[PDB]
């Protein structure tokens, strides 16, 4: 299985 | 509640292995003026703070009273600090599902997590946190019994565990009951990995930034989707969205009682796990 999964662009996963 | 001992009150018996700061020896307590024995894990730390403080903080990890939260049973001050706890004859969570990946079933893994889970709200409740729980530090009492040890050691002793903080933790050093959910998060996710290694192939000082990026530890393949938005609502960025201890508890124990139903493992239903003399008395045993 891979290292990472992504979860963008959602808002609570990704910080700004 | 916590009992000073003397260097001489007790012996390290063998190695069982050493981790962050100091090493862990299986040894024997012997409660000088009494023929007993009690069968212990002794942990020597590695030497900025004082001796008169250390001791305030045991008075206080010496007072944690909960089936699934490890308590310390005494302390030697000497040249050295070291922790007198009770034995945990089966090891570390970690090593445990790791030695046993083929034999472990849906009941089994989620109580645990119910179980962990219920620790870390015990130490919730009375505004105590942890910071560096994981795999690593949930002992097995009994492979259907397990709980969290090592709980104020970090705070005791300021390599960091990256991969298991949460973000804010990361950048701005902020612990909080708030963040153990999130460490939590990534126990669980060891847990059912059987073991696996979290981001493994990234390198610490990058995590910071592939988690700014949105991305997570991955969904586990024995994780039907309803568990791994759990694991994954843990990561949040904003740290009071994240599930209480509480939330989790029932979440999960709601799950203990359909196994099968939230877990895919492959042959589920065919699946079974597991010195002395005399005088030998059991840590319960010795302090009535």
Redesign the interface.
């Given at each position: 299985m891979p290292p990472t999964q992504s979860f963008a662009p959602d808002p609570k996963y990704v910080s700004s | 509640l916590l009992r000073i001992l003397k260097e001489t009150e007790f012996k390290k018996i063998k190695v069982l292995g050493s981790g962050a700061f100091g090493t862990v020896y299986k040894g024997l307590w012997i409660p000088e003026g009494e023929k007993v024995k009690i069968p212990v894990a002794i942990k020597e730390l590695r030497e900025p703070k004082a001796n008169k403080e250390i001791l305030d903080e045991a008075y206080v990890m010496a007072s944690v009273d909960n089936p699934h939260v490890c308590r310390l049973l005494g302390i030697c001050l000497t040249s050295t600090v070291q922790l007198i706890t009770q034995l945990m004859p089966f090891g570390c969570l970690l090593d445990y599902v790791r030695e046993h990946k083929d034999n472990i079933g849906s009941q089994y893994l989620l109580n645990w997590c119910v179980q962990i889970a219920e620790g870390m709200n015990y130490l919730e409740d009375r505004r105590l946190v942890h910071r560096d729980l994981a795999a690593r530090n949930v002992l097995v009492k009994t492979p259907q019994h397990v709980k969290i040890t090592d709980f104020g050691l970090a705070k005791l002793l300021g390599k960091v565990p990256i991969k298991w903080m949460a973000?804010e933790s990361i950048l701005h050093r902020i612990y909080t009951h708030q963040s153990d959910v999130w460490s939590y998060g990534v126990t669980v996710w060891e847990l059912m990995?059987f073991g696996?290694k979290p981001?493994?192939?990234?390198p610490a000082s990058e995590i910071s930034s592939?988690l700014?990026?949105?991305?997570?530890?991955?969904?586990?393949?024995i994780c039907t989707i309803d568990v791994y938005m759990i694991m994954?609502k843990c990561?949040?960025?904003?740290a009071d969205?994240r599930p209480k201890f509480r939330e989790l508890i029932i979440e999960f124990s709601k799950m203990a009682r359909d196994p099968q139903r939230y877990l895919v493992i492959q042959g589920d239903e065919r699946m079974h796990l597991p010195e002395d003399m005399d005088d030998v008395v059991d840590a319960d045993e010795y302090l009535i």
């Open positions: - | 973000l990995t696996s981001y493994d192939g990234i592939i700014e990026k949105g991305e997570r530890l991955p969904q586990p393949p994954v990561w949040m960025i904003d969205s």
